[PDB]
Amino acid sequence: EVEAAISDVGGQQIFSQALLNANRRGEAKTALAEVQARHQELLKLEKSMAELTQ
């Protein structure tokens, strides 16, 4: 007559992935992309003070 055939229900697991804040944007965001123009200024101090020391 009868027996077993399909059984369980209460039993499962799940992993979990993750995205990230957008503002993050490219690494260049404050104190990163400005270092290009901040360097020309610093080269200006170096120079103007080279005039100073000479």
Partner: protein, 146 residues
């Protein structure tokens, strides 16, 4: 005459001018020797160290105009050891770089180094003349090697 009077300073002013004119006249070895004397007189004097860096550079430049790159190398090593201010200076690095260019036979690399040094420290007329001579000696050596 100033050196006999213990006028180190006026002596040095005269010997700067003598060495510069000698180097411009093709007398590179004697100019280097006068620069050696001037260096020896300016060691240990807190007041003159700025000239001292300049001094080392000029000596090497004459030694590069005489095609004696070994002399430039020993001058640069000497200055690096006896004057810490020269060791870390732009002049020492520039003279290392010129010696490296001369030993390689790469005149373009020398001109690049001259431009780089110019951007940070204006090459006066004298340095331009001696550096042009050094470049010409390099180019002449390739022209013979070709």
């Amino acid at each position: 005459w100033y050196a006999q009077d213990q006028s180190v300073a006026l002596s040095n002013k005269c010997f700067i001018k003598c060495a510069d004119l000698k180097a411009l006249d093709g007398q590179y070895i004697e100019a280097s020797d006068i620069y050696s004397k001037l260096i020896k007189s300016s060691m240990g004097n807190r007041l003159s160290q700025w000239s001292l860096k300049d001094y080392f550079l000029k000596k090497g430049l004459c030694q590069l105009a005489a095609t004696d790159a070994v002399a430039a190398a020993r001058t640069l090593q000497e200055g690096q050891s006896e004057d810490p201010n020269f060791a870390d200076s732009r002049e020492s690095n520039f003279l290392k770089s010129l010696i490296d260019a001369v030993n390689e036979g790469d005149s373009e690399q020398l001109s690049e180094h001259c431009k780089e040094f110019d951007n940070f420290m204006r090459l006066d007329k004298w340095k331009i003349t001696i550096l042009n001579k050094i470049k010409e000696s390099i180019q002449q050596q390739e022209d013979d090697l070709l």
